[PDB]
């Protein structure tokens, strides 16, 4: 088989600036016809891969003039001119010279935008859920940058540990921020013992930690 290699797992870029994504093939993709059989794909968060470039250098229909492909028989470059927020996702090269067709491992485009503080929100367990004997308390951090944040759960001012899970969205296609949920899980019995449930967020965009809380 032909092995397709993308050396960088991700590449940083400031929006408006340019970026290059590189690919190598273990065998020349130039056929005996002058065409080089290398495709480029973008997979945006939540979507299927989409064709960008075909035959190494040919822009596919609807793809902006900002994307261009260049290269030799074995070493290829996708150049993105003036990167926009909408360009985030994973870029994959694929050879279509010989079956089996094979892909590079992909390169994520990370947009390095400006600092943005999270809007924090706290949600108590619903009454419907409390019936089943479990309480989920949710802390939401919306549209922040950079990705790093510290979320701390405090119950009756006693710092929690071991009893929460976080999830973070992919970089957003529109504003290049992240959002995060932290779900605190306790039994109903353990929930009813306490009064003040608080979520304390630490982040670079916050001159002081934001705490959101509720009384049971």
């Amino acid at each position: 088989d032909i092995v397709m290699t993308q050396a960088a797992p991700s590449v940083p870029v400031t929006p408006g600036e340019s970026v290059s994504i590189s690919c190598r093939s273990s065998k020349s993709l130039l056929h005996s016809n002058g065409n080089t059989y290398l495709y480029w794909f973008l997979q945006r968060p939540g979507q299927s891969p989409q064709l960008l470039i075909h035959r190494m250098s040919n822009l596919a229909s609807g793809v902006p003039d900002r994307f261009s492909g260049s290269g030799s028989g074995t070493a290829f470059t996708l150049r993105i001119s003036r990167v926009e927020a909408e360009d985030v996702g994973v870029y994959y090269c694929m050879q279509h010279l010989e079956y089996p067709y094979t892909f590079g491992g992909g390169t994520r485009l990370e947009v390095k935008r400006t600092v943005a503080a999270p809007s924090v929100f706290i949600f108590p367990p619903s009454d419907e859920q409390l019936k089943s004997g479990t309480a989920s308390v949710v802390c939401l951090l919306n549209n922040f940058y950079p990705r790093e944040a510290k979320v701390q759960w405090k119950v009756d001012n006693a710092l929690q540990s071991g009893n929460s899970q976080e999830s973070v969205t992919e970089q957003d296609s529109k504003d290049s921020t992240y959002s995060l949920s932290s779900t605190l899980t306790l039994s109903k019995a353990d929930y009813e013992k306490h009064k003040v449930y608080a979520c304390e967020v630490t982040h670079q965009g916050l001159s002081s930690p934001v705490t959101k809380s509720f009384n049971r």
Binding site: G105, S132, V138, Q165, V168, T169
Partner: protein
Amino acid sequence: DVQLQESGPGLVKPSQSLSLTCSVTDYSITSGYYWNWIRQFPGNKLEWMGYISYDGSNNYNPSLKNRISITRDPSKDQFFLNLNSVTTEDTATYYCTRGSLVWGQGTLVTVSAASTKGPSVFPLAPSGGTAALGCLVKDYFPEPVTVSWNSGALTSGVHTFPAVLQSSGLYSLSSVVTVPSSSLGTQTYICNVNHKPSNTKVDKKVEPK
């Protein structure tokens, strides 16, 4: 215009056969093109599995070639993937494609002995200007759920977080939306949760507490 849509069970037991259907709309599969199955493993690596061509001819990745069949039924404009003797290595998102240009939305297949389980959907109630509300979608298996808001009419300001597999072996996520806090009294907000593997749709109204 031409569209491809995968269907199939989200769950297959270890050592059993996986069968997926690609339904092609607005195109005759006997007319032209090569019709591919491509899969994406957790961790995001892509593998081309094989095709059936317009003329019923086959080519399969030597990776699978003993276990794979790609067939078709032009009377329904569908082509099929069969993969025998699945292991945990076969857990992936399966895409059907027309050439490189037209891709289905993908179907997740999880290789597991466990049964399907539909989600519980709980409101995340707004506790101004704008406010966040949402739905906690808990205790389902396997992936995925899809979440829409007010039947597809509210799409601006929506975040549906990646699922996390809990210690119980069931998945959980939240979907949240940012909303005018003046419309909290008069506007109805319902999260539409679809869990295909269990054929369960849940509609939950999220009301201020």
